[PDB]
Amino acid sequence: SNAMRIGVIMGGVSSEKQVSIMTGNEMIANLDKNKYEIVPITLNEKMDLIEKAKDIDFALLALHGKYGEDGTVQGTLESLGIPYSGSNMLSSGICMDKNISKKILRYEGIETPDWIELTKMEDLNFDELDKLGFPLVVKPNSVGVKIVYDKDELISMLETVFEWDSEVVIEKYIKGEEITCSIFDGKQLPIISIRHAAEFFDYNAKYDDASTIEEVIELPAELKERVNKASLACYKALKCSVYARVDMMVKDGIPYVMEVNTLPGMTQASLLPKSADAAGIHYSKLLDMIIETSLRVRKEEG
């Protein structure tokens, strides 16, 4: 039995590169050595992939952020006829574009927060802005998401963001419970709650706003059914394959989709593998399912 040669693809620039290295190392360390011949691939520049992938049967992506999201790596691998993990080039690019992904979701009737799309030299229509109210969340579509409380803050923040990016999403702020829903091959995994830590005095909870805890949670049946329905619908709508993670906010019992991730964290401390583990899927087996399901999917694509 000749072992399939798995390239573990690492790369990116700055902190993304480091997260990528850490991810690849975990994969390399947990890949079943009897099933696979493991081939670490570290990309000094993105297009070095063409040379380094000559010796692999499959590309397992350890990438993090733009390099793995924009779709170029997937498209290159496809052009080389080399099967790879996760969503394809178009699904990846769509999911990475928050504006375009929200349009498609909203077209499909999936709840997502109201928003304005704005490009760099484009003016800003204050009548539609006012419809949104304040606070607002400014999302580059290097610089992170930021809550702004009024017109002046918004203006100032647009100017900060636009120097680096040419496009922004301005989203209505929603105060609610944050959750994230991992999907593997069209099946919903355990939901994870993301909230502040509390100190409890009897039944009074005092929250620490500087903290964040992530915990697997079972939601009440009604909301659970609604959440599972929305997340799978995102998955199909955005043409995702193999696995994805949908980030949502719940208010008044209604889930809103903030984003869909085709390249979610894959370290053992990351949300998706934590969800899989709660589902009885240990890390090494999650890696087996990704390779196995990806091969099937790349074959269905031709």
Ligand X SMILES: Nc1ncnc2c1ncn2[C@@H]1O[C@H](COP(=O)(O)OP(=O)(O)OP(=O)(O)O)[C@@H](O)[C@H]1O
Residues contributing to the annotated binding site for ATP: 129-180
Q: From the list Ca ion, a second copy, ligand X, none, which binds 145 (C-beta under 5 to 8 Å, kind-based)?
A: ligand X
274 lies in the site for ligand X, by CB under 6 A: no
Exposed (0-12), middle (13-18) or buried (19+): which is 274, by Cβ within 10 Å? buried
Report how many residues bind Ca ion under the rule CB under 5 A. 3
Which residues 219-248 are close enough to bind Ca ion by CB under 5 A?
Answer: 247
Q: What span, in angstroms and rounded, lies between the C-alpha atoms of 167 and 165?
A: 6
Task: Cite the annotated binding site by residue number.
Answer: 129-180, 247, 259, 261
Q: Give the C-alpha separation, 141 to 169, whole Å.
A: 6
CA distance 242 to 290: 7
Q: What residues are paired with 7 via a beta bridge?
A: 39, 59
Interaction between residue 69 and Ca ion (CB under 5 A): no
243-272 residues in contact with ligand X (CB under 6 A) are 247, 249, 258-259, 261
* Least Cβ distance, residue 16 to ligand X (angstroms): 10
Q: Is 81 in the site for Ca ion (CB under 5 A)?
A: no
Report yes or no: 53 and 77 within 8 Å, Cβ to Cβ.
yes
Least distance in Å: CB of 234 to ligand X?
13
Please give the DSSP secondary-structure letter assigned to residue 84: B
Q: Considering only 26-34, 50-58, 182-190, 256-264, which stretch makes contact with Ca ion by CB under 5 A?
A: 256-264
Question: How many Å separate Cα 299 from the centre of its chain?
Answer: 24
89 binds, among ligand X, Ca ion, a second copy, none (CB under 5 to 8 A by kind): a second copy
Beta carbons of 231 and 181 less than 8 angstroms apart: yes
Q: Are 40 and 24 in contact (CB under 8 A)?
A: yes
SS3 160: helix
Per the structure block, which two tokens stand in for 264? 């979610």
Minimum separation from the CB atom of position 301 to a second copy (A): 6
- What span, in angstroms and rounded, lies between the C-alpha atoms of 221 and 235? 21
Q: For ligand X, give the closer residue by CB, 134 or 173.
A: 173
Spatial separation of the C-alpha atoms in residues 71 and 263, rounded to whole Å: 11
From Ca ion, a second copy, ligand X, none, interface partner of 171 (C-beta below 5 to 8 A by class): ligand X
Least distance (Å) between residue 67 CB and a second copy: 9
| Residue 144 within binding range of Ca ion, rule CB under 5 A | no
* Separation of alpha carbons 79 and 190, rounded Å: 35
Which residues would be at the binding site for a second copy (CB under 8 A)? 46-47, 50, 70-72, 75-76, 78-80, 89-90, 93-94, 97, 100, 103-104, 106-108, 120-121, 164-166, 239, 300-302
- Segment 156-185, which members bind ligand X (CB under 6 A)? 171, 173-174, 178
The answer to whether residue 145 forms part of the interface with ligand X (CB under 6 A) is yes
Write out the residues near Ca ion by the rule CB under 5 A: 247, 259, 280
